[PDB]
Structure 1
Amino acid sequence: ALTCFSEGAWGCCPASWKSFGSSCYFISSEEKVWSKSEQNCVEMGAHLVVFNTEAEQNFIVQQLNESFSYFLGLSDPQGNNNWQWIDKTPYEKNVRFWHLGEPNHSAEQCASIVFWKPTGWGWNDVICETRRNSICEMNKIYL
């Protein structure tokens, strides 16, 4: 089942997915390692989330549980601080919302969004083989 909204054409998302902008989003409450999280999003036709604007992140974090961290579509494969987005958008020309003091270790090659007060939601690099929740993102279905 799809839930469709008018585009002023229709923008459709799977019924259990949250809608925003030109993308659909799914918040996976099952804890997996990063590579298994990406494969789970790929099995639904999506990828791990790629943050393109601040507004996209503000919508997403309203759906999250503050007591958990969520894997993002951002990784450092060679541990050389060369962060790459899962959909090959340029990391240098894109938004970056790292927490104060992050990233902070080349061995932490995967990016996660987490709630650290007083700052709140922000990115943190973590070990990829740690099991955490994740966020998937696919484009809207236009009919």
Structure 2
Amino acid sequence: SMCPKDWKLFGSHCYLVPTVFSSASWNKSEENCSRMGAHLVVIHSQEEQDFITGILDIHAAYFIGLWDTGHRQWQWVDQTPYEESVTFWHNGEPSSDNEKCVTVYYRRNIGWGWNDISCNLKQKSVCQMKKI
């Protein structure tokens, strides 16, 4: 009802790990989400971070809707403000100015967190949309 078939409800949003799209670049992942009236996940709280990572496979890395528009100048795909105080970077991350796109992946005996990687590397992804 509140979410389309196969999507998962949390708060005011619906979430999906696409399959049909085995693996794809950040840009291609964002267009795939956008074609379903969604966008790569925008994470504004611990609760969102935990919900999103709860529906993922710990053996896979997933693009989120966060990327570097300039020099460590992070933006969300829905234009909502980047709050450095409410982030989930793995220790040592973000690591490199060469890596402008952000994945969420699981570090054994630590848990889930964000990693800057190359935007051209193919990863899984997670889409988010307002509920119906």
What's the TM-score once normalised by structure 1's chain length? Answer: 0.87
Post-superposition offset of 1:28 = 2.1
**RMSD of Structure 2 on Structure 1 (CA):** 1.2
Asked if residue 75 in structure 1 is aligned to residue 67 in structure 2, the reply is yes
- Tell me, in whole angstroms, the C-alpha distance in 2 between the residues paired with 1:94 and 1:37: 27
- Which residue number corresponds to residue 124 of structure 1? 115
Q: Offset of 1:81 from its aligned partner?
A: 0.3
Q: 1:102 aligns with which of 89, 93, 106?
A: 93
**Partner amino acid, structure 2, of 1:61:** T
Aligned partner of 2:75 in structure 1 is 84
1:63 to 55, 60, 63: 55
Please say which structure displays the higher CA radius of gyration: 1
Distance 2:99 2:46 in 1: 24
Percent of aligned pairs sharing the same letter: 47
Gaps of 5+ in 1: 5-11
Cα distance in 1, alignment partners of residues 86 and 129 from structure 2: 19
Aligned residues: 130
SS in 2 for 1:40: helix
1:18-29 to 2 correspondences below 5 Å: 18-29=8-19
Report the TM-score, using the length of structure 2 for normalisation.
0.94
Displacement of 1:90 in angstroms is 1.2
1:31 equivalent in structure 2: 23
> How many angstroms does 1:136 deviate by?
0.3
The alpha-carbon deviation at position 97 of structure 1 amounts to: 0.4
Question: C-alpha separation between the residues in 2 aligned to 1:102 and 1:28?
Answer: 26
In structure 2, runs of 5+ residues without a counterpart are none
Alpha-carbon distance in 2 for matches of 1:132, 1:77:
20
